[PDB]
Design a protein around this ligand. Sequence first.
Ligand SMILES: CN1CCN(C2=Nc3cc(Cl)ccc3Nc3ccccc32)CC1
Lengths: 204, 232, 32, 306, 266
Amino acid sequence: CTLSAEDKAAVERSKMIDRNLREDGEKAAREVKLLLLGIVTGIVETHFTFKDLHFKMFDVGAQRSERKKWIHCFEGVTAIIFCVALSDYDLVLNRMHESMKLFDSICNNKWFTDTSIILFLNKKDLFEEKIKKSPLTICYPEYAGSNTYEEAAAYIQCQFEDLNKRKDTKEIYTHFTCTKNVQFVFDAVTDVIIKNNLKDCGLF
Amino acid sequence: VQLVESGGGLVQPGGSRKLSCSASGFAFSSFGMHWVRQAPEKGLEWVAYISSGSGTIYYADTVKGRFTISRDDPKNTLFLQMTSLRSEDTAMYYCVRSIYYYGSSPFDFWGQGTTLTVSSADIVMTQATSSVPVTPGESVSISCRSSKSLLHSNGNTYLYWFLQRPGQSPQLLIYRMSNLASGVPDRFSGSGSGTAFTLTISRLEAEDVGVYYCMQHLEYPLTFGAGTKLEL
Amino acid sequence: SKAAADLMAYCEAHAKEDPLLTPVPASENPFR
Amino acid sequence: NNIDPVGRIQMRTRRTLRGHLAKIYAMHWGTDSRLLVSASQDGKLIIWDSYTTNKVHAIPLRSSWVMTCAYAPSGNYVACGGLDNICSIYNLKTREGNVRVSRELAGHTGYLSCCRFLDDNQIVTSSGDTTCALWDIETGQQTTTFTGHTGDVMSLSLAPDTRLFVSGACDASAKLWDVREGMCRQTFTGHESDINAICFFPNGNAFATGSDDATCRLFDLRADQELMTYSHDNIICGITSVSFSKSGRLLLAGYDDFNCNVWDALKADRAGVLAGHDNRVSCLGVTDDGMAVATGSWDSFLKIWN
Amino acid sequence: TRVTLAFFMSLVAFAIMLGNALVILAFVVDKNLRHRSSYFFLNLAISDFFVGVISIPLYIPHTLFEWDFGKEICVFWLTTDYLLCTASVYNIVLISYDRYLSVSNAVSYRTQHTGVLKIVTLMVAVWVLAFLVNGPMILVSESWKDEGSECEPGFFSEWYILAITSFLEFVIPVILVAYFNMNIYWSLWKVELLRARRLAKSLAILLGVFAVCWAPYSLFTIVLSFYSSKSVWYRIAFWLQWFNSFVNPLLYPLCHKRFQKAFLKI
Ligand SMILES: CN1CCN(C2=Nc3cc(Cl)ccc3Nc3ccccc32)CC1
């Protein structure tokens, strides 16, 4: 042995530090990290708990810069919440084109290849009253449906959902925003867990 | 920081006695602790050592198998239990902190000490002299000897210089033979060569006379000298 | 050329003080 | 053309430092050339013992979205920052024996990219607000703020002489700034995309930038132009980190091809691959006495070479 | 001649040995493999290692050239061989149960923090259970010591004992593996057609390889021991039993993504 009386204590100190690091990693490696984009300066972190599960949601809408130099730090998230409206389909700023461009950019991005996406549509009552005198023909001239909410809503839903280019790897769980949002996201993350779980041990 | 101890007094030979230490104003559970002593008329002696995490435990060969050391981290307390006490065990004891990581300063704080009067190849250090009368306004040079070379393989040296004033507890003047502990006047120095080392108090002033000691911490047990009595 | 000369001159002067350029024999290297 | 090539410089992993679990984003060398500091998404900042591969200190954080860390030149304090717009400063040497956070500099709104100490009382920060700032730690408020970027600032470095500093932003531009007055000394351009890594040459007469367009560059502070370009055809990915050595011959450049490359800073053409990571190279540094090189990558392992 | 047969038996043994040595190496090298799956696969590889170094080369001469065992060696040979095979099957079942708990109740499978004591408890219960099921019967056999006899446990004279042993080592593993895989399929299925077909095919392949490589010998042995107290098909079934440990390090711990990374680093 080529140590003094105190290098042994130095080694013991390093061992305690290693144990503490490993324990903290075990504690922090079993939480579900969801990123919210569009229900509720810099990152606004929100924590809550549901059915023995720890949800850490990131409200990141306060940043005033692009996403290229900013989003890759969320590589390991379980899922993305996406929130958009239906009532503003015709409001020229319009808004449907912006939302569709955002969704296409997000869904077909490499960092979220295996990452599913939850998608919400809200402000549906204003849309329903609007279509009474303002049909979708203003924004969808090719639309040839009945002047009822159901056909138009299905049209819009399939319009967004037909943008998926990764049909056999990740799905989209579309739900009309109306406490059913928490139940929807819980079921979605359970199914994400199962599908990503029977994948790392073969089973295709 | 603060260290306050309980358990001292007069004890009959034999039996057992336990001395406890309470820490205040620092992170207790990241420190190793030593119990040291000083004879009622002679120099210092070491007793025992416990380290961080309640792992390593060391006793002196004189006290081996009869003194046991322990700690308690939630309440910031330290214990030395003492069995097989004999009349030669009379002394006054010090609880000394020591944090062992790279660059730290061990022995940087000593408690107020508690009195306890009882009714081989070990490196023993011989204090070079016993009294040097030096008038105030002139430098003081004190030395001590060692039984064994102290340069370890890692380039270190392990000699410690302490000072004690009347009615008081020691303080750390020099640690590892060359370093000056922060919180003391910067007119001290230490030097020397193998097994023969020296402390220097330059431009002696008042309240700077008393007993001086050296220590070795290269391998257990820990020992002391006699203690040079610098007087006026 | 003046700017490049200034930086290259500093490289030459501190040549022998760079272990990564001239690896020290294991007698003095603490990382073995 | 008269400079002899250093040739193939092989290096061996003397120490593999394990203990970081998630991704690693920053590291800085200490002043005694023996202690190290590393930042990860465990919310951890670790001070390593380098000689014996020991751990000296471990520090938890508050905002786990870190991007940078710093080491006080006197060994007393550390600092960190990230996506939360504020810069935190911790005191290492207290009689209490534990590291405590002494200062919390606030007043930014864009994400902090970097922070470096001036002395025990002055610091410099650059964030996503497109603005740099000099902070006086004792007072707690900026003494001067620097405006003139149109895009987020991703790097800065402090001169050895401790009088100036250079920053770079997502505008494919860099800016040299005085410290005590507030003027913009100079503005440099030339990259084809955003700049994400800058370093300060030890002689104080040059600096090097890394880009997300498969190129590294050296500019000169006085000549106001780019000096050198460092890229290879087999490379298509982006730079992440840049550093120099004591003499400056070895420019250590991280990449996204998973392989650190040591470049002969004078011939602009050499790649001493320090292969050995399984992921993207994030951070890297070199000791004051040149005794080692440390690299850290996305795989959570930190490697020491000489 | 017999030289070719000996060469091929030794070739099979060497292949088994290497196949499990690689798993053991890639678990001791990389420190990111400290989950349940890697510990269980290591148990599997160790249980399959000793078949290639002890049983096969020791068995080659006893039937090939000369019956140079005696009791003091053949007792050891029997005990080792039986213990290893049973332990390998039980590790297969344990991995599949891990897999079923994976996608049966995944909420409770995500927030547990038990580190070593539990895992090594399981890794040791496997071997203890394998021994206490198979081993204590070989040693208690005495009639098998008749002079001039080929060495094989005495309880071959009792078909009931063979039935109990094969029930506690063939019926239960195939039932458990089939149930776990079917529940995995249902719990996923309740674009989509291709994924469902891939999952069904892979699960069928695993269960089928198990059944093919372990049914004939048990069936043929109990058939011969029933009333007709050796033909070439007996050798076929005998070696088909050992031929599982050739593929068991190829289905489970080579498809896995983490272990694939661990191997490709080397
Ligand atoms: C190459 N192989 C090695 C193992 N081996 C048997 N192995 C077990 C072990 C257990 Cl626990 C249950 C059932 C069986 N099958 C058997 C049935 C009849 C005779 C022998 C066996 C015989 C030869």
